[PDB]
Amino acid sequence: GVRTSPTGEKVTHTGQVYDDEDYRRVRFVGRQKEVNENFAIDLIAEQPVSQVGSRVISCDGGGGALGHPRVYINLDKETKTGTCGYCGLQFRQQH
């Protein structure tokens, strides 16, 4: 999931990689930089999009009082995917 630098190091999920003009590579000497190899981007696009044929639909995040508060989102385009800002998972309608 992670990349490899042209300098031989890693990127994070945020692109904060180094160059040879940097001394933070020489403060990384002998101690392996911890970096999560499991990102947060690819845990959304792999999930198939939920399809509920209402108009104004609800979102909690799978459970009562565990997750994000009740946010009502809309599906009133023809084909574009409405996406909750809290959930980060799309929705579609089936008329």
Partner 1 sequence: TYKYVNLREPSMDMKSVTDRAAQTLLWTELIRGLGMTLSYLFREPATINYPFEKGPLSPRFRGEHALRRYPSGEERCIACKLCEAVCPAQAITIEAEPRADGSRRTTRYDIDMTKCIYCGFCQEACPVDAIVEGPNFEFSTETHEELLYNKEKLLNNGDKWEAEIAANIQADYLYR
Partner 2 sequence: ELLQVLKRGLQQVSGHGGLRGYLRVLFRANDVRVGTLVGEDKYGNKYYEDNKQFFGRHRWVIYTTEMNGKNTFWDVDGSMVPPEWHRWLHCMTDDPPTVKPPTARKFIWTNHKFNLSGTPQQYVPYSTTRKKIQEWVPPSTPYK
Partner 3 sequence: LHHAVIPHGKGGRSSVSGIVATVFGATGFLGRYLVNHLGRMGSQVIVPYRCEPYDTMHLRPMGDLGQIIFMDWNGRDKDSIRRAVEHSNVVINLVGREWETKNFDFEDVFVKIPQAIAQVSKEAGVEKFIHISHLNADIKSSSKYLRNKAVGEKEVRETFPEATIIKPADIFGREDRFLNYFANIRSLGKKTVKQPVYIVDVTKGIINAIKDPDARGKTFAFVGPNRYLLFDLVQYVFAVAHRPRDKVERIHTTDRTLPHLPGLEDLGVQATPLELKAIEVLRRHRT
Residues contributing to the site for partner 3 (CB under 8 A): 19-23, 25-27, 29-30
Q: Which of 1, 20, 38, 66 binds partner 2 (CB under 8 A)?
A: 38
- Told to check if 49 binds partner 1 by CB under 8 A, we report no
Please name the residue ranges forming H helices in the chain.
Answer: 24-27, 42-45
* Distance in angstroms (rounded) separating the CA atoms of residues 46 and 17: 26
Minimum CB separation of residue 20 from partner 3 in Å reads 8
Distance between CA atoms of 53 and 22, rounded to whole angstroms? 54
Closest contact distance (angstroms) between CB of 91 and partner 3 is: 44
Helix (H, G, I), strand (E, B) or coil at 70: coil
The footprint of partner 2 (CB under 8 A) covers: 12, 14-16, 24, 27-28, 30-34, 38, 43
